[PDB]
Design a protein around this motif. Structure first.
Motif, mmCIF file in Angstrom:
data_model
loop_
_atom_site.group_PDB
_atom_site.id
_atom_site.type_symbol
_atom_site.label_atom_id
_atom_site.label_comp_id
_atom_site.label_asym_id
_atom_site.label_seq_id
_atom_site.Cartn_x
_atom_site.Cartn_y
_atom_site.Cartn_z
ATOM 1 N N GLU A 98 0.842 -1.181 0.000
ATOM 2 C CA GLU A 98 0.000 0.000 0.000
ATOM 3 C C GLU A 98 0.885 1.242 0.000
ATOM 4 O O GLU A 98 2.113 1.161 -0.075
ATOM 5 C CB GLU A 98 -0.956 -0.018 1.193
ATOM 6 N N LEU A 99 0.259 2.407 0.069
ATOM 7 C CA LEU A 99 0.990 3.662 0.023
ATOM 8 C C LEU A 99 1.051 4.276 1.421
ATOM 9 O O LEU A 99 0.600 3.684 2.410
ATOM 10 C CB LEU A 99 0.357 4.607 -0.999
ATOM 11 N N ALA A 100 1.626 5.474 1.501
ATOM 12 C CA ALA A 100 1.856 6.181 2.755
ATOM 13 C C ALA A 100 1.360 7.617 2.652
ATOM 14 O O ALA A 100 2.089 8.571 2.932
ATOM 15 C CB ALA A 100 3.333 6.146 3.141
ATOM 16 N N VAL A 101 0.111 7.776 2.207
ATOM 17 C CA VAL A 101 -0.504 9.080 1.970
ATOM 18 C C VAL A 101 -0.233 10.024 3.137
ATOM 19 O O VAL A 101 -0.373 9.652 4.307
ATOM 20 C CB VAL A 101 -2.016 8.941 1.701
ATOM 21 N N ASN A 152 8.599 12.542 3.662
ATOM 22 C CA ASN A 152 8.525 11.235 4.290
ATOM 23 C C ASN A 152 7.572 11.282 5.468
ATOM 24 O O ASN A 152 7.702 12.172 6.321
ATOM 25 C CB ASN A 152 9.920 10.802 4.764
ATOM 26 N N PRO A 153 6.611 10.363 5.569
ATOM 27 C CA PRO A 153 5.813 10.270 6.797
ATOM 28 C C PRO A 153 6.672 9.925 8.003
ATOM 29 O O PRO A 153 7.861 9.627 7.858
ATOM 30 C CB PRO A 153 4.800 9.160 6.480
ATOM 31 N N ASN A 154 6.079 9.986 9.200
ATOM 32 C CA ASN A 154 6.781 9.771 10.462
ATOM 33 C C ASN A 154 7.839 10.843 10.695
ATOM 34 O O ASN A 154 8.666 10.716 11.604
ATOM 35 C CB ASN A 154 7.427 8.383 10.511
ATOM 36 N N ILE A 155 7.833 11.890 9.874
ATOM 37 C CA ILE A 155 8.805 12.971 9.969
ATOM 38 C C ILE A 155 8.071 14.300 9.857
ATOM 39 O O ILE A 155 7.339 14.528 8.888
ATOM 40 C CB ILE A 155 9.896 12.856 8.885
ATOM 41 N N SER A 156 8.273 15.176 10.841
ATOM 42 C CA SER A 156 7.722 16.521 10.825
ATOM 43 C C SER A 156 8.839 17.514 11.112
ATOM 44 O O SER A 156 9.788 17.210 11.841
ATOM 45 C CB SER A 156 6.594 16.683 11.851
ATOM 46 N N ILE A 157 8.721 18.707 10.534
ATOM 47 C CA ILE A 157 9.774 19.716 10.600
ATOM 48 C C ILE A 157 9.158 21.052 10.985
ATOM 49 O O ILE A 157 8.067 21.402 10.521
ATOM 50 C CB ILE A 157 10.533 19.839 9.262
ATOM 51 N N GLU A 158 9.859 21.797 11.834
ATOM 52 C CA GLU A 158 9.479 23.158 12.187
ATOM 53 C C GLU A 158 10.740 23.989 12.367
ATOM 54 O O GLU A 158 11.849 23.463 12.485
ATOM 55 C CB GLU A 158 8.625 23.197 13.461
ATOM 56 N N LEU A 159 10.563 25.305 12.386
ATOM 57 C CA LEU A 159 11.666 26.237 12.559
ATOM 58 C C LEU A 159 11.679 26.792 13.976
ATOM 59 O O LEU A 159 10.631 27.063 14.568
ATOM 60 C CB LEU A 159 11.566 27.386 11.555
ATOM 61 N N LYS A 160 12.880 26.953 14.519
ATOM 62 C CA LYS A 160 13.072 27.595 15.810
ATOM 63 C C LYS A 160 13.952 28.833 15.732
ATOM 64 O O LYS A 160 13.652 29.838 16.379
ATOM 65 C CB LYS A 160 13.666 26.601 16.819
ATOM 66 N N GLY A 175 14.864 5.545 4.734
ATOM 67 C CA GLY A 175 15.302 6.672 3.936
ATOM 68 C C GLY A 175 16.415 7.484 4.563
ATOM 69 O O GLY A 175 17.301 7.975 3.856
ATOM 70 N N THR A 176 16.383 7.640 5.883
ATOM 71 C CA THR A 176 17.418 8.395 6.570
ATOM 72 C C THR A 176 18.769 7.700 6.435
ATOM 73 O O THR A 176 18.859 6.494 6.202
ATOM 74 C CB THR A 176 17.073 8.570 8.051
ATOM 75 N N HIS A 177 19.835 8.488 6.585
ATOM 76 C CA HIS A 177 21.206 7.989 6.446
ATOM 77 C C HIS A 177 22.013 8.522 7.628
ATOM 78 O O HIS A 177 22.554 9.629 7.575
ATOM 79 C CB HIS A 177 21.803 8.400 5.109
ATOM 80 N N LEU A 178 22.069 7.735 8.697
ATOM 81 C CA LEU A 178 22.839 8.111 9.872
ATOM 82 C C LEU A 178 24.337 8.064 9.573
ATOM 83 O O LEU A 178 24.808 7.257 8.768
ATOM 84 C CB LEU A 178 22.504 7.192 11.045
ATOM 85 N N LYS A 179 25.083 8.948 10.230
ATOM 86 C CA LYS A 179 26.529 9.047 10.018
ATOM 87 C C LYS A 179 27.150 9.765 11.205
ATOM 88 O O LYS A 179 26.777 10.906 11.498
ATOM 89 C CB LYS A 179 26.839 9.791 8.717
ATOM 90 N N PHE A 180 28.093 9.112 11.874
ATOM 91 C CA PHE A 180 28.864 9.724 12.942
ATOM 92 C C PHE A 180 30.158 10.289 12.367
ATOM 93 O O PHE A 180 30.361 10.318 11.148
ATOM 94 C CB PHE A 180 29.124 8.706 14.056
ATOM 95 N N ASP A 181 31.056 10.743 13.244
ATOM 96 C CA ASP A 181 32.318 11.337 12.816
ATOM 97 C C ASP A 181 33.536 10.596 13.356
ATOM 98 O O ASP A 181 34.664 11.066 13.169
ATOM 99 C CB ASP A 181 32.383 12.809 13.234
ATOM 100 N N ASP A 182 33.344 9.461 14.024
ATOM 101 C CA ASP A 182 34.456 8.673 14.537
ATOM 102 C C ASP A 182 34.054 7.204 14.560
ATOM 103 O O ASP A 182 32.884 6.856 14.386
ATOM 104 C CB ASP A 182 34.899 9.168 15.919
ATOM 105 N N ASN A 183 35.043 6.342 14.770
ATOM 106 C CA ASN A 183 34.828 4.903 14.836
ATOM 107 C C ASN A 183 34.945 4.447 16.287
ATOM 108 O O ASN A 183 35.984 4.656 16.924
ATOM 109 C CB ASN A 183 35.833 4.157 13.951
ATOM 110 N N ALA A 184 33.889 3.822 16.800
ATOM 111 C CA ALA A 184 33.822 3.403 18.191
ATOM 112 C C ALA A 184 33.422 1.934 18.265
ATOM 113 O O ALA A 184 33.136 1.296 17.247
ATOM 114 C CB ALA A 184 32.841 4.276 18.984
ATOM 115 N N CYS A 185 33.412 1.394 19.480
ATOM 116 C CA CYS A 185 33.021 0.008 19.716
ATOM 117 C C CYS A 185 32.756 -0.173 21.204
ATOM 118 O O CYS A 185 33.017 0.719 22.015
ATOM 119 C CB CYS A 185 34.094 -0.972 19.236
ATOM 120 N N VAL A 186 32.220 -1.341 21.550
ATOM 121 C CA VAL A 186 32.041 -1.756 22.935
ATOM 122 C C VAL A 186 32.620 -3.155 23.092
ATOM 123 O O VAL A 186 32.636 -3.952 22.150
ATOM 124 C CB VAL A 186 30.559 -1.719 23.373
#
Ligand SMILES: [Mg+2]
Ligand SMILES: [Mg+2]
Ligand SMILES: [Mg+2]
Ligand SMILES: [Mg+2]
Ligand SMILES: [Mg+2]
Ligand SMILES: [Mg+2]
Ligand SMILES: [Zn+2]
Lengths: 229, 119, 56, 115, 122
Positions: free
Chosen positions: A221-224, D81-89, E74-85
């Motif tokens: 389905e879609l994500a309207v 993208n759904p699940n995402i909302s944006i506003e300005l501060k 869709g998001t693309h997370l990215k840090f600035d260093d390499n870490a571990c535990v």
RNA sequence: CAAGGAACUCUGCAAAUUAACCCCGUAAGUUAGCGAGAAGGGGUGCUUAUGUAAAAGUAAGCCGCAGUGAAGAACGAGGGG
RNA sequence: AGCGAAAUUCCUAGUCGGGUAAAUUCCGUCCCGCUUGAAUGGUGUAACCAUCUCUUGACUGUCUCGGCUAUAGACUCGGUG
RNA sequence: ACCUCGAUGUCGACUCAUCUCAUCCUCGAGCUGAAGCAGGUUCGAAGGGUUCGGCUGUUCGCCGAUUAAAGAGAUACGUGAGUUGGGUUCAAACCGUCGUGAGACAGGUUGGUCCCUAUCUAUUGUGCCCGUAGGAAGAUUGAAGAGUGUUGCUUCUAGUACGAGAGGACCGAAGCGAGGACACCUCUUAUGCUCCAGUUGUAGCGCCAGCUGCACCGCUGGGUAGUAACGUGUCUAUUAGAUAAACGCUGAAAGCAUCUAAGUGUGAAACUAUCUCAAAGAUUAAUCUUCCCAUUUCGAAAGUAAGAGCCGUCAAAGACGAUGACGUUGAUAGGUUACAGGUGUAAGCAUAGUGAUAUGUUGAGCUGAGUAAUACUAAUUGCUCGAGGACU
């Protein structure tokens, strides 16, 4: 099985957002309704196939024997004619659209002419390796490796058939299987296909029922959007 | 071979284009190789269409391309252009120059052509 | 890499079979009589019915 | 027949969001995110400064950079993208459309406010 | 994209200031460890009063990457260093406290003890 | 050229870093000459004012991601034959 | 005397310790030194070396892993050959 | 000591592999001092895979961490007209030893020139000609082929069967992966020399400002189209037939017994297909459809009106050919217009500041390839080849 197929063109590639909240890349296919031109029956000529005619054009832009064939058969003049094996449930002169053959999200495969790249090297063709660049490995160091098979009259004294070397690459028919349909748009004669579609934009693309999974469907389905301000 | 001529660098290409378009503005016709006229024509058309306003900004933009010639120096060439060449083309949408082909030279069999502009 | 046997007078002709030439398309210029090669200007100064050059 | 390549734009025209607040490269925002593990979708705030506003439609993206416990983190997003909302501060002054130079400065490096 | 022999920072209270990769696990010729993938390492620099001495071989779970990685939504997370535990052979860190944020893709693989001890998951 | 930074390899070969001027700061060892430009750091743009004989220098202010903004400038440390 | 698995040691990739996750190479030590050894000199030695050899910081397309761009060739056309 | 001393370049390393099975894993099976888990041995099986590092010139080896596995071999101990030269194997020098001495040591140590434009064949591709019994334009079938086939982890079945007790399954289902392959550029990055912005020096445009030439594209931050991967999609199945080892049913030969002799099965990543690609030069030249043609008189010679070629504008193509689109009855290229995208508030002016400069005009200006419209320019009012189906 009773394969379903349809012809279209490729007009770009984009993305869409669906339920489960995942980004799905989308190729957009302008699928003008095709028109059957010949029904090759099992009895008549020892196999079952149906011939489609698409890419409708003006009558003047057509060769004389082809236009005569179209007039005698009482169809509409088109530039291209092709047939699909094992397509049965259609009769002469019946218009067909992709909505009459497919569900919204079932499984299809796609075959289209690839993107040509001209005469190319061996490494870029067969995914070979490159000799070292340090310690002065000499100049001819972008080559397919040793083609030697045996030295001496007993062993090989030749280079084997079907070797892997440089040559013309691309501009050949290729097929990606199990690409889900995503959505239709009857208003603009448009279909949506997941994944990446081979071939340069503006070419000719063919869609068929996936052979690996003929009738399998996993609907999406879609994500309207629900954002307003 | 390791040492070689500087060849046809981008700077050389654009400078040749500058010289040829300046010569076209000065005289109105050039006998050059066809595959150079087919490139010069773009900048020629752009300069001709840009000069239909005669504001100082357009003359500044034109300054970026012209080169002085024996017949006309750069400022006099500007005056000539903006005073009589541009007014002649105030209603033709695009296509101010034509590129017709001559016979090959005896020296190299290269296909000389005439880059010419007229209404 | 050098030839091991002498390439005969037959193989050389077979290779040079494709080195033949071909004639360029020719047309009769209008308003004046000559055979210029097609899509070019004649030495007569006319490309079709138009002025592009001097007398010669 | 013939085409337009605006058929693309027509097919994104369905899922394009409505309001899409206007922000340039040098702004700081707060992006509410919806996370669904099983149920009762928790909203996670992620506030920081913008680094880019690239895109051509549904492919619009932006970069938001944040620092927690001295560790600088940035996360890319898709606007439409759904699940995402944006506003300005706050709205800030800057002369570059992609401020990469904010990856190599510690504190006391804050973009000045824009009246 | 931490690969073979990749010195990288450490993000707990084990006193393992500087640690390098010794092998990426899970298959033959893995040559890459993205967020979550367990690796074995070898501590090359520690603190004097640390529970792990220099030169030991240990397995660790990467948490922060400089290259980042595309997420499904869709998001693309990215840090600035390499870490571990520094885990201990089932799911648990050899330390008690975790420094800095930790990625979320550790949620599915397991490692819920890390997310419990993590200061702020992203 | 992203991430990594010798995993290449017979060997960091080759390539890469630093580089000018000015200012802090410089160990072990020694034939007391050296080590040593050791190591490791800071500043340079523009404008005004103050500078003195010119200028360095100093104060105030402004701009850019970057201020010998290009071109020319030493990469070191440790042990051994 | 001194030094000593050494530019010398076949067994030998000797034992041990240091360096590394792992070290036929390296540093220190041990001495059955086949056959080390004193002006064909023996042992140390500060500085110096386009000398040899090992560890390491920064550094990098050397490499995991190839990719792109521009010229001059390569290729096509005319001339010499 | 048989070919090569009027030269067959020899170790190792890199690149590309191919082949055998005396099998390392995956696959099937028998036996067991095989409770289960885990094994040991043997039979069948070559489809695919068989790691990364320290030391040594190293093969070999030892070690470390892994994986399902880190197979055994062959191919001039595969592979220098593909690379290297660390070693061997030139002259230099030194150490130990031997020789009275020149010198010598499969004893050691440092340094030390690696040539070739491809004629034939083989292969990778791409073309011209001709042929297939009239010519032409399309659509096909597919003989003979090529390519791919790797596997792990977790959860559930189930802590069930088994076992006293630790422990702990067969058969199957689902999810997530590594490697490899095929595409694609919406996302992330790389590059992106007639793009945008900042900026240094110098010489000019008679000076300010503003531009140009050069300095690695002068340098720096971005970046269109395009090309790609580190990026995202798919695949790596499933099924059928015939079989290997093996297990059989029935059944005698040999009144029992007996898997075989008749008959009848079950049976593996191997084989033939299912999947992908190419393919009638398949001369054994296949089939179908459509279009064009039957004249000029003693075998000719007009030779189309179907079509094609030459030439031109080009690119989804491209080394040149070719392929694909279009040649005024036209949107093929360029130009113009509008837009996208990128860059990021142009120049000039006004105000404030003594001045660098700041604000307003201004989300302005600019734009290589991008999207689309429009005959304004360029694809001319051209030449050539090409038909009567020969006999049964
Ligand atoms: Mg050489
Ligand atoms: Mg001979
Ligand atoms: Mg020839
Ligand atoms: Mg001496
Ligand atoms: Mg000989
Ligand atoms: Mg060679
Ligand atoms: Zn004429």
């Amino acid at each position: 099985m009773e394969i379903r197929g349809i012809f279209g063109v490729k007009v770009g590639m984009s993305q869409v957002f669906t339920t489960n909240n995942e980004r799905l890349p989308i190729t957009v296919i302008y699928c003008e309704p095709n028109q059957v031109a010949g029904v090759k029956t099992e009895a008549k000529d020892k196999y079952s196939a149906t011939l489609l005619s698409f890419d409708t054009v003006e009558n003047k832009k057509l060769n004389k024997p082809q236009q005569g064939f179209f007039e005698k058969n009482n169809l509409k003049p088109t530039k291209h004619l092709q047939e699909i094996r094992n397509m049965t449930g259609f009769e002469m002169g019946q218009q067909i659209t992709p909505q009459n053959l497919f569900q919204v999200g079932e499984y299809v495969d796609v075959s289209a002419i690839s993107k040509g790249r001209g005469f190319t090297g061996a490494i870029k063709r067969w995914n070979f390796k490159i000799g070292p660049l340090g310690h002065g490995a000499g100049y001819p160091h972008r080559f397919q490796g040793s083609v030697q098979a045996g030295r001496g009259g007993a062993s090989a004294q030749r280079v084997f058939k079907g070797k892997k070397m440089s040559g013309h690459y691309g501009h050949e028919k290729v097929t990606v299987q199990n690409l889900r349909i995503v959505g239709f748009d009857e208003a603009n004669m448009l279909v949506l296909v997941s994944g990446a579609i081979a071939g340069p934009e503006g070419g000719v693309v063919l869609i068929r029922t996936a052979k690996k999974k003929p009738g399998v469907v996993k609907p999406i389905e879609l994500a309207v959007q629900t954002e307003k301000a | 071979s390791y040492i070689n001529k500087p060849g046809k660098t981008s700077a050389w290409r654009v400078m040749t284009v500058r010289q040829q378009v300046s010569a076209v503005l000065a005289y109105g016709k050039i006998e050059t190789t066809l595959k150079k006229a087919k490139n010069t024509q773009k900048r020629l058309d752009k300069l001709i269409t840009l000069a239909k306003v005669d504001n100082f900004n357009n003359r500044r933009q034109v300054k970026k391309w012209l080169l002085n010639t024996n017949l006309f120096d750069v400022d006099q060439l500007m005056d000539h252009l903006f005073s009589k060449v541009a007014p002649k083309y105030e209603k033709t949408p695009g296509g101010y120059s034509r590129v017709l082909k001559l016979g090959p030279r005896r020296g190299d069999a290269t296909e000389m052509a005439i880059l010419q502009l007229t209404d | 890499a050098v030839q091991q046997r002498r390439s005969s007078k037959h193989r050389r002709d077979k290779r040079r079979s494709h080195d033949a030439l071909t004639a360029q398309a020719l047309s009769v210029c209008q308003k004046c009589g000559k055979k210029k090669l097609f899509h070019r200007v004649c030495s007569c100064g006319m490309y079709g019915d138009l002025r592009v050059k001097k007398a010669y | 027949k013939i085409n337009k390549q605006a058929l693309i734009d027509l097919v994104e025209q369905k899922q394009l969001k409505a309001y899409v607040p206007e922000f340039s490269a040098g702004d700081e925002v707060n992006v509410a995110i919806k996370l669904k593990e099983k149920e009762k979708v928790r909203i996670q705030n992620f506030t920081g400064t913008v680094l880019r506003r690239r895109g051509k439609g549904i492919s619009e993206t932006f970069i938001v950079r944040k620092t927690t416990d001295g560790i600088p983190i940035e996360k890319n997003f898709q606007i439409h993208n759904p699940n995402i909302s944006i506003e300005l501060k706050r709205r800030g002054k800057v002369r570059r459309a992609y401020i990469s130079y904010m990856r190599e400065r510690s504190g006391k490096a804050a973009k000045i406010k824009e009246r | 994209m931490v690969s073979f022999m990749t010195r990288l920072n450490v993000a707990d209270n084990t006193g393992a200031k500087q640690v390098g990769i010794i092998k990426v696990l899970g298959s033959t010729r893995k040559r890459y460890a993205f967020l979550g993938d367990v690796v074995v390492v070898s501590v090359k620099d520690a603190i004097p009063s640390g529970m792990v001495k220099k030169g030991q071989v240990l397995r660790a779970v990467i948490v922060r990457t400089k290259k980042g990685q595309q997420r499904k939504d869709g998001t693309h997370l990215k840090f600035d260093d390499n870490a571990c535990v520094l885990i201990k052979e089932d799911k648990s860190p050899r330390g008690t406290r975790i420094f800095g944020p930790v990625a979320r893709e550790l949620r599915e693989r397991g490692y819920n003890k890390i997310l419990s001890l993590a200061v702020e998951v992203v």
